Design a protein around this ligand. Sequence first.
Ligand SMILES: OCCCCCO[C@H]1O[C@H](CO)[C@@H](O)[C@H](O)[C@H]1O
Length: 632
Amino acid sequence: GNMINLTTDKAVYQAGEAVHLNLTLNNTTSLAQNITATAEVYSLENKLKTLQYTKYLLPNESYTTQKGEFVIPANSLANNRGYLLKVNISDSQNNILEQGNRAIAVEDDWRTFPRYAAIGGSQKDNNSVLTKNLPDYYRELEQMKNMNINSYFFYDVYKSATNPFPNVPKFDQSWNWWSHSQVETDAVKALVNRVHQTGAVAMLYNMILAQNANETAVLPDTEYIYNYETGGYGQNGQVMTYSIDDKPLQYYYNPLSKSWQNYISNAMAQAMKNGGFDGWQGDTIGDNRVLSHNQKDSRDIAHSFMLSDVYAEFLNKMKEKLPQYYLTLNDVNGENISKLANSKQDVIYNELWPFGTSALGNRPQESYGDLKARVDQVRQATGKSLIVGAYMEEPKFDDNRIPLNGAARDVLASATYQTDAVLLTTAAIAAAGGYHMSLAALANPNDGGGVGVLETAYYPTQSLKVSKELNRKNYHYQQFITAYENLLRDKVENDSAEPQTFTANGRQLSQDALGINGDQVWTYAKKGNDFRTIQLLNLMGITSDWKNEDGYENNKTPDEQTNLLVTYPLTGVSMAEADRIAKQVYLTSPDDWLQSSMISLATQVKTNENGDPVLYIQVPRLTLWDMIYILE
Ligand SMILES: OCCCCCO[C@H]1O[C@H](CO)[C@@H](O)[C@H](O)[C@H]1O
């Protein structure tokens, strides 16, 4: 990495707010000398500012800049944009001693460009949320802050589905039968307060229709929902019940019940106000065909309805009854975007599994291309950037602790998460215009002082270690995703123009623009108002499965490429416009060779048989992910 320790006072900024930076100048030399920190402020390719500070330092002496010394004043940056701070530390000979880049996010609120992370109890402490772990939480949240995280998903900090956050000092989570976790409410409040200090929001996870089965009913049975057919929630004409091993765990209420709507909204309002939360991260147990209480005995299918057919109305009622609060509902596998397109969700959140049906058609949602397709489907239906839960690897064991997958064999060997696997999944979602909710503050020692990576639905579980390599590249990836949000997900659509990628020696590397096959440089274009982009995702010599359930048994580090050619056709553009464009082609990558820096590319303008111009773009390097940026 570097030792610049580049830090900002907040995670995110209002346009009318100053950015206070701190940075550390390290005289890593044997010579007493002026050490210079130069921080260039870029808005895409354009250098807006150079900031600069010099301090005379003795050998091995360091100096951290004080409040006021590096600042970007209020009203310096346009609103709802990402920026990059490109820092070089230099000695009195103009040798570069170190370099590090940091994004700056300026935005009204988190809804335009969500960058969402999880917070959850500590595995080493029964999954509890405890005051004694605040130091580790705060350390993780300092890191997420400098990664520009703007929102936080508080997972399993609730007492019960119907009493989510009572004003008591500590409560048991009695629905936790595996580890009997507890929550100290002062811990959750301190967490929320710390999130707020960074400019970020705190979302409370809770079900929307549920009550825990061993608590008195909050409403009488006229409000319950009933099964239309016998299945996994019990018998036709019985209350929809979630059970494990013939013990009822949860009962469900009718989304159309006005009394349930008023109950749960007010219960959430109170819970949220108790914690200082900013909104509701909603969840449902799964879809079902159901009957209202008064229809419970009907065998007439036309008297029944799919719960998902009423989610939009239910949500709209929640918004209306919770107007100052953010609202979203996890749509598992993204099955219902057309149903939910007009609901007043503030953000779209889909938890995606490899076994869901792809937005592509009749195939599992198993590859990087399937993640893009779902991101695009959401964008098309709502205009919003999809937040994706795509948990990585998920080691699983049988009863003899026999591994049921390769990742589980890595667990037995005390191995790490496969760094490039995680990064390629985050790249696939981001390059498509979405955001991979992957990062977690879990006070978990397998996270080695850094932030965790979500591996399973039960967020507190960390079976594999986060290498310092993964920690450091995750940070680079977050800066890229922030600094280039206006190119990735701000009125940017798929482009019908078809870019291709070649080596210097005759191979076409781009083979399947859908991203469903591996062993290729996955290459596709996007189109914004005055630009185009080309995403290059390196899958040379690797498979396209995003989850990497095999762990290290399936290598996910793709074959590094050098001196590639990318062609991009300029159908119907004149030679003079093409020549202007050809001088305005740039590249950036979150990978170590650039760490979000942008460079100019050598480009030639050629034509087809009919005088139609085509850019021939030289790409120095591709490690995992490159973005070409074409001003047009
Ligand atoms: O979209 C479906 C997500 C919910 C799946 C099961 O969740 C439930 O069960 C989980 C444990 O399996 C709990 O951690 C959680 O609080 C509770 O809501």
